[PDB]
Amino acid sequence: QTVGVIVRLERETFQVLNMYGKVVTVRHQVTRKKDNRFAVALDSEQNNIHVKDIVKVIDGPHSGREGEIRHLFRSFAFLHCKKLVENGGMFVCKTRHLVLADNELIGQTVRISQGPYKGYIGVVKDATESTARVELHSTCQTISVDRQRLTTV
Amino acid sequence: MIYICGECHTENEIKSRDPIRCRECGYRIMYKKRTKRLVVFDAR
Amino acid sequence: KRITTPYMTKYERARVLGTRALQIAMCAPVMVELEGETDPLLIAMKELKARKIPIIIRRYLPDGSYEDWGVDELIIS
Amino acid sequence: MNAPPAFESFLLFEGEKKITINKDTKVPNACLFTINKEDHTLGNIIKSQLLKDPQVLFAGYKVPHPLEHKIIIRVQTTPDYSPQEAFTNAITDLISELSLLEERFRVAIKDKQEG
Amino acid sequence: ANMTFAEIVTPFNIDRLQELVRRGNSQYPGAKYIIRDNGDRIDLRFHP
Amino acid sequence: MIIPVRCFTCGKIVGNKWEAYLGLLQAEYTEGDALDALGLKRYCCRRMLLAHVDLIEKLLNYAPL
Amino acid sequence: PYANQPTVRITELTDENVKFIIENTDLAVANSIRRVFIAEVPIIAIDWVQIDANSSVLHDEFIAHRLGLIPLTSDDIVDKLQYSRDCTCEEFCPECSVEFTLDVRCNEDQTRHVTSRDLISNSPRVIPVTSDDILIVKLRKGQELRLRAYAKKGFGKEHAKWNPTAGVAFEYDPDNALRHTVYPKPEEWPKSEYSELDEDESQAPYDPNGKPERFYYNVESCGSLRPETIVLSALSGLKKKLSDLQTQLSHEIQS
Ligand SMILES: [Zn+2]
Ligand SMILES: [Zn+2]
Ligand SMILES: [Zn+2]
């Protein structure tokens, strides 16, 4: 329910700064989330902002500071600032208080009910919106057919 | 699942953690039963 | 007074056609009016027959010096 | 594995026309009929029938590749006659001949049955 | 169908290469990869 | 192993004649006479019964499993 | 400028084969007619095959291949029948297919012969042609073989199992009057059954103004169709092909 950003590396623990702005001390065995570097967030003035963008904090507890975005959330953003000597320069603010400076048919036994390949049976290797690959049981090949041409067993 | 003893044709089920053995022969070769999935052939 | 031959060697033809075809593939301007062509190779050949490719060949003489040649200056065979 | 679907050796798949015409530019009155999903069965007989007509200056056919199933028939007639007209007349002549042959073959079957 | 050639997108072949990208690896002829100028490789058998 | 259904070359049925060919051989027919009796004139079909080896008899000796 | 007026003479008529002569015709028409005999006289052959259970020594597709080459009596039914890929049905229906069933359970130490007799059609109009009978596979005690198949309309060009003729003997110019062939030593060669050359010559005198004619046919059926039915359906199919081509050419020219 809540992500965290490491703000200090220690012998046996991580000092982690979370979305709430609360610095916590946690064990080595938190999970690494897949960062989304292409995520888009809106500042307080309806300007698209991405990571590594220098953004000023005009509202919130950290109002007046200016920092570089390093991580993003649905409604939070983590700002780094070398001048700030707190938590390695890392803090967090809500995004709206900133300003920029698998197909179910896969592996299913199917039966060609329409088209030149009628009669036969196969298994769906790949499936799309329109067509789908079928490994044909009958002959030593695989071919693609419209999903309209398929009828499941 | 079901397997056939290779000597006396004794159909028998075997768990996933017991060594195989014919339940009436003691034989130690088993063959899988035929698949119960639909199989079709074009006669070409 | 360029002492080298006034002819285009087959290797020079190969390199100039390949490079100009790649240039055309990179959305370069075409110095000849095409006639509905899509392949850069054919367009480069058309330019070569027109003698309208802006490349300059630099033949390095074995003594370290060199000669410079316009493509239209050389004899295309 | 690359063996073709044999049933797609005589069936027009989608976006394929049975026959197309191309007026050859080398010689006037010269046309090329490209027919898909056919073989020597129609090509040879149509070639012979076109050769029967004296108004057809030249008539021939080829298969560009046996694995493919195009046949290209070149037809050249006099400059008062369409090659398409020659093609249609040849087809009508062959169909009339085969209908006559069917009738005579039925008559022969009946004769041999009674006889 | 397996072996491939790299064609640069130009305003002449944009339609043909667009259709080839649409077809994908499943049918012949098709394509495997889109290589944009950034270097990212979009594989054309997993991203519909 | 088993007799083919048809002659490969021409396509005449031959799968209803191997057992009859054996039976006529037990009558001490010369093999040519036997094949003539079974209506096989073109040597394409005669090749079939003259050169076929019926290994299925040697294969049924094993267990049915 | 019009096609010849062919004349027919049936020399021999039997239920397995037929022998006839076509006169006043072109070579190409005769060649196309024999090509249609082998290629485009459709019949019904067991194509689709579901193995419910197999325990014979022979793997399944071997049995399916053997069942494919079984000829079937399709004299009249093949006309009203239709191609499965053309008909509108889920998989199969009587309008485009015929169901077969087979089940043999050998629990006797004596050898068993699964033959064509054991095939069970759901319509008596189509049966194995032998119904001695064709052997499909030998079975031992303890071996079963159970399956259900479907036979459908097709012709020999698609696959040789739909080939209705067991060989089409063809001849023309038996005396070699046209000299289309060049015997290096004509003395060595046998005379055809139609050649009128007496047994002191080997070639008719070379006719310059001759043309191919008097085409001799001996069409041998597998028994799936009667031979006269094969020839009649051949001519009908070739006429159908040419009429369809005329329709497409008319549409092309109008376009
Ligand atoms: Zn046992
Ligand atoms: Zn034979
Ligand atoms: Zn149907």
Curated annotation (Swiss-Prot), chain A:
It comes from the Eukaryota. Changing residue 32 to E: Reduces the affinity for Pol II elongation complex. Residues 49-82, 104-137 form the KOW domain. Ubiquitously expressed. Changing residue 33 to E: Reduces the affinity for Pol II elongation complex. The modification N6-acetyllysine is found at residue 118. RNA binds at residue 34. Changing residue 34 to E: Reduces the affinity for Pol II elongation complex. DNA binds at residue 74. Changing residue 37 to E: Reduces the affinity for Pol II elongation complex. Changing residue 34 to A: Reduces the affinity for Pol II elongation complex. Methylated by PRMT1/HRMT1L2 and PRMT5/SKB1. Methylation negatively regulates interaction with P-TEFb and RNA polymerase II. Phosphorylated by CDK7 and CDK9. Phosphorylation by P-TEFb (CDK9) at Thr residues of the C-terminal repeats alleviates transcriptional pausing and promotes transcription elongation. Dephosphorylated by the INTAC complex when transcripts are unfavorably configured for transcriptional elongation, leading to premature transcription termination: dephosphorylation is mediated by the PPP2CA component of the INTAC complex. Dephosphorylated by the PNUTS-PP1 complex in termination zones downstream of poly(A) sites, thereby promoting deceleration of RNA polymerase II transcription. Changing residue 37 to A: Reduces the affinity for Pol II elongation complex. It is found in: Nucleus. Component of the DRB sensitivity-inducing factor complex (DSIF complex), which regulates mRNA processing and transcription elongation by RNA polymerase II. DSIF positively regulates mRNA capping by stimulating the mRNA guanylyltransferase activity of RNGTT/CAP1A. DSIF also acts cooperatively with the negative elongation factor complex (NELF complex) to enhance transcriptional pausing at sites proximal to the promoter. Transcriptional pausing may facilitate the assembly of an elongation competent RNA polymerase II complex. Interacts with SUPT4H1 to form DSIF. DSIF interacts with the positive transcription elongation factor b complex (P-TEFb complex), which is composed of CDK9 and cyclin-T (CCNT1 or CCNT2). DSIF interacts with RNA polymerase II (Pol II); forms DNA and RNA clamps that stabilize Pol II elongation complex while maintaining the nontemplate DNA strand in the transcription bubble and nascent RNA in the exit channel. This interaction is reduced by phosphorylation of the C-terminal domain (CTD) of POLR2A by P-TEFb. Belongs to the SPT5 family. This is Transcription elongation factor SPT5. It comes from Homo sapiens (Human). The lineage of its organism: Eukaryota, Metazoa, Chordata, Craniata, Vertebrata. The chain holds residues 545 to 753 of 1087 of the full protein.
